[PDB]
């Protein structure tokens, strides 16, 4: 499809950044999670970054760790996430849906088979957290074969070769982990989105101010889920209170 292009063309012509919330699928339950994601969308999330619970999330803090164990306690499997994903795309035809995966869940039953499954349910992009561009060739080929954008992190310690490789290999959007925003607009690189420490409206604003095309709240939306496990109804309202405020800061 063409979902990431059209989103960035609309937010540009609206003079607003992209707000992309992260949330792990099935946190804390399946039908509970679906209502969370609907509520993030209702309050104006421009796209979604969605995690699949993995056994050993060696690149994730304790908030997402317990987010994962919450879903495993719910009995959430990769198979169940893809049934969620098909249900979310069927409700929301235009919103870009991006996955944040661990390499083993992509590699497990066949790399091409995973990305084929992504296209089948309407996923737009996949960032594999523990696959650097040096190891990415079979992943980004399977991605591009199935009309999935491969996302790559542009780390703070990025050298110039990395910058060009990320510009060349990456589609959809660039995940910024001043000088770097310079050099990705350099080489026809997908729009950069800041993801380091966005848990306030006041850090979204600043990220849009520095020239990025958006910001990703890599967690503390999952802190909202954690803070209100026993209070489902209050969890939803408190979630909208957040994302509305953060999306209000996007402009």
């Amino acid at each position: 499809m063409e979902r990431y292009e059209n989103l960035f063309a609309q937010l540009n012509d609206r003079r607003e950044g992209a707000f992309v919330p992260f949330v792990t699928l099935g946190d804390p339950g399946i039908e509970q999670s679906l209502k969370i994601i609907d509520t993030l969308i209702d309050a104006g999330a421009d796209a979604l970054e969605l995690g699949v619970p993995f056994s050993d999330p060696l690149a994730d803090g304790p908030t997402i760790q317990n987010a994962n164990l919450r879903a495993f306690a719910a009995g959430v499997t990769p198979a169940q996430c893809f049934e969620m994903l098909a249900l979310i795309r069927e409700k929301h035809p235009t919103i870009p849906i991006g996955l944040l995966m661990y390499a083993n869940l992509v590699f497990n039953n066949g790399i091409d088979a995973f990305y084929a499954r992504c296209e089948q349910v309407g996923v737009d992009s996949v960032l594999v957290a523990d696959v650097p561009v040096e190891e990415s060739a079979p992943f980004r080929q399977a991605a591009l074969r199935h009309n999935i954008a491969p996302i790559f992190i542009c780390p703070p310690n990025a050298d110039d070769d990395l910058l060009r490789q990320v510009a060349s290999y990456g589609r959809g959007y660039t995940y910024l982990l001043h000088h770097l925003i310079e050099k990705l607009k350099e080489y026809h690189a997908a729009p950069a989105l800041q993801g380091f420490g966005i848990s306030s409206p006041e850090q979204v604003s600043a990220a849009v101010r520095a020239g990025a095309a958006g910001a990703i709240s890599g967690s503390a939306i999952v802190k909202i889920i954690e803070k209100n496990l026993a209070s489902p109804k209050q969890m939803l309202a408190e979630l909208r209170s957040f994302v509305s405020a953060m999306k209000a800061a996007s402009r």
């Binding site: 056994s55 999330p57 869940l105 497990n108 650097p132 040096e134 992190i153 310690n157 070769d161």
Partner: protein, 395 residues
């Protein structure tokens, strides 16, 4: 881009978040530089000889092979300072860390022998050390938890997952992802992302080099087979490495069978797992049909790991090395037998390699065979564990 080949056949790689690749490339260049540097080698050789106690003995077992055609030597890494082979490659990584201007050290440990080694090396060479250990392994390997603490290191129990080695590895790689600026991650086995499986092999290869020289001096020929337990792979590749091109020499790695392979409760992914991507490497692992990492099990903390180093997976695949498994009960009998008939108390890890050697002898007692078992460690850390077992069994 790298200087060295990050893969062994299909296995290996550098499957880390992009943020850690500069760290891995920096360690690789420092390693290549150091390997070329006579002053590094002279310094590494000096610490191994005058601080750690190399060369270690090669001990011929008189009693346990009586009545058979097996001649069995034990390579005595149990005599190395610290109580295990771990100490060899931490001295080399510590020198590398100072070479890179690092002043902190991060480590994982399950048997506590890698934690002890990291702590003693950091105390000697003035590095600040912190170490992740499974809360389960804090308990069955408690002789090593004290030792780490009085040497000035921070021991951080980890309760996630199976509270074992895997879980500490996860914590440690998370920590280094933020602290790599000033800290070196002193990985404790021949696994993880490149260049670690290569570095750890080369900093352990003296085991096999010495063994070759000693067995030539004592027997006038190479061993029929060298036998080592395999947890992540460092002691075994340390023994194998110098014999790989000696194709008459068998290379046998022994994974923990735990309660028995058929029970699912084991640590033998090489032969009873399947390839996946985890801990920075593409390697055999024990994993659900979903691709979730299964939890491993072994009576020995040092082998309770659900993956294996990629050079072993490669050596297996081409047929150069064979891999087998040895159960808890088998390792315990080899432990008892070595204590009573040779007066050596071996690590329960090392007992797995001894157990398979005893099976090679006993199944074919008229087969003439010259065997070497890498006795990776001493079993002082295991005596309380072995006590409660044999007590609960009325023995």
């Amino acid at each position: 881009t790298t200087l060295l080949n990050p893969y062994f056949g299909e296995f290996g790689g550098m499957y880390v978040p992009q943020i850690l690749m500069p760290a891995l490339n920096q360690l690789e260049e420092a390693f290549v530089s150091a390997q070329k540097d006579p002053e590094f080698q002279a310094q590494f050789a000096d610490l191994l000889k005058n601080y750690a106690g190399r060369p270690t003995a090669l001990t011929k077992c008189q009693n346990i092979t009586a009545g058979t055609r097996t001649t069995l030597y034990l390579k005595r890494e149990d005599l190395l300072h610290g109580g295990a082979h771990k100490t060899n490659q931490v001295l080399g990584q510590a020198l590398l860390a100072k070479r890179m201007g690092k002043s902190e050290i991060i480590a994982e440990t399950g048997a506590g022998q890698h934690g002890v080694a990291s702590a003693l090396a950091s105390a000697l060479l003035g590095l600040k050390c912190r170490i992740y250990m499974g809360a389960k392994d804090v308990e069955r390997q408690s002789p090593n938890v004290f030792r780490m603490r009085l040497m000035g290191a921070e021991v951080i129990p980890v309760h996630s997952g199976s509270a074992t080695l895997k879980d500490a590895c996860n914590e440690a790689l998370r920590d280094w992802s933020g602290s790599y600026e000033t800290a070196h991650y002193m990985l404790g086995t021949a696994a993880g992302p490149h260049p670690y499986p290569t570095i750890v092999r080369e900093f352990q290869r003296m085991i096999g080099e010495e063994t070759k020289a000693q067995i030539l001096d004592k027997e006038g020929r190479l061993p029929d087979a060298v036998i080592a337990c395999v947890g992540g792979g460092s002691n075994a590749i340390g023994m194998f490495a110098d014999f790989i091109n000696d194709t008459s020499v068998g290379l046998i790695g022994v994974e923990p069978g735990g309660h028995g392979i058929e029970t699912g409760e084991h640590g033998a992914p090489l032969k009873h797992g399947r390839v996946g991507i985890y801990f920075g490497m593409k390697a055999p692992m024990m994993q659900t049909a979903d691709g979730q990492i299964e939890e491993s099990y072994s009576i020995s903390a040092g082998l309770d790991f659900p993956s294996v180093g990629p050079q072993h997976a490669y050596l297996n695949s081409i047929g150069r090395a064979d891999y087998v498994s040895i159960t808890d009960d088998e390792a315990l009998e080899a432990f008892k037998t070595l204590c009573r008939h040779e007066g050596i108390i071996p690590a329960l890890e090392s007992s797995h390699a001894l157990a398979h050697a005893l099976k090679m002898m006993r199944e074919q007692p008229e087969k003439e065979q010259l065997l070497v078992v890498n006795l990776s460690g001493r079993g002082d850390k295991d005596i309380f564990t072995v006590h409660d077992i044999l007590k609960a069994r009325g023995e």
